[PDB]
Amino acid sequence: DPVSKGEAVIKEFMRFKVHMEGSMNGHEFEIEGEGEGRPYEGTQTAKLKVTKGGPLPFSWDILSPQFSRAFTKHPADIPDYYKQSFPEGFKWERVMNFEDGGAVTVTQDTSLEDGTLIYKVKLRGTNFPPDGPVMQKKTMGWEASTERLYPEDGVLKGDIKMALRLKDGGRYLADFKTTYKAKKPVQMPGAYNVDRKLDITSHNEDYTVVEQYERSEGRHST
Incomplete structure (x- = not known):
């Protein structure tokens, strides 16, 4: 039932809209955007605009x-x-823990309205050193990653070792932990991995308009 219901509603080509409200070291901001992709090929793009x-x-x-x-x-x-x-869709809750003490909590809702995926994001980041690479804008994107997922009482739990490239050639490390919760019972996978590459593909001078690409592929663990 749930696989068949999902297969019928998630098409080979899908669009989304996203809104994010957030704060970083008490600095409030908002983002609005739109995206599109091929949900069974694991590819997608989005265009995001800073609104506040x-x-x-x-x-x-x-x-x-x-x-x-x-x-x-x-x-x-x-x-x-x-x-x-x-x-109905699903929700998720994430913590990002950086090597220098930066910490972020993220909560997300995913719904479907008139054949368009709808994403609502809340973000709170604290404890970033003001002179660190995040607050100084000295990062140059995420290295390819492997999210290790396992099933637990109807939810998926994921762990990722993440690495942010530094402008000087360094690596700036973080650990991501996320819980993903469907809004109805679904057929649960076993534990598996998701390999991802996420790229900023274009941006305006001040990163108030940004385009991203993500490729994501699930596989068994050996």
Whole structure:
């Protein structure tokens, strides 16, 4: 039932709209955007615009992984927790923990209205050193990653070792922990991994208009 319901509502081509409200070291901001992709190929794009609190006094990179779980490719034998949750959708809650003490909490709602995916994001980041690479905008995107997911009482729990490139050639590390919760019962996968590359593909001078691309592919763990 849930797989069949999800398969019928998530098409080979899908659009989304996103709104984010957030704060970083007490600096309030808002983002609005739109995106599109191929949910079974695991590819997507989005165009985001800063609507309040711009130009952002912090790296765009903190925000980019918060803009789309319906767009992951799976092999034949791993059921899609996220696509099955439709039309009702799912929520998620994330903590990002950085090597220098920066900490972010993110909460997200995913719904479907008139055949368009709708994303609402709330973000709170604290404890970033004001002279650190995030607040100085000295990051240059996320390295490719592997999210390790496991099922737990009807939800998925994911862990990611993440790495932000530094302008000087360094790596700035973080750990992401996320809980993903469908709004109705779905057929649960076993534990599996999601390999991702997320790229900023274009931006205006002050990063108040930004385009991103993400490729995401599920696989078994060996």
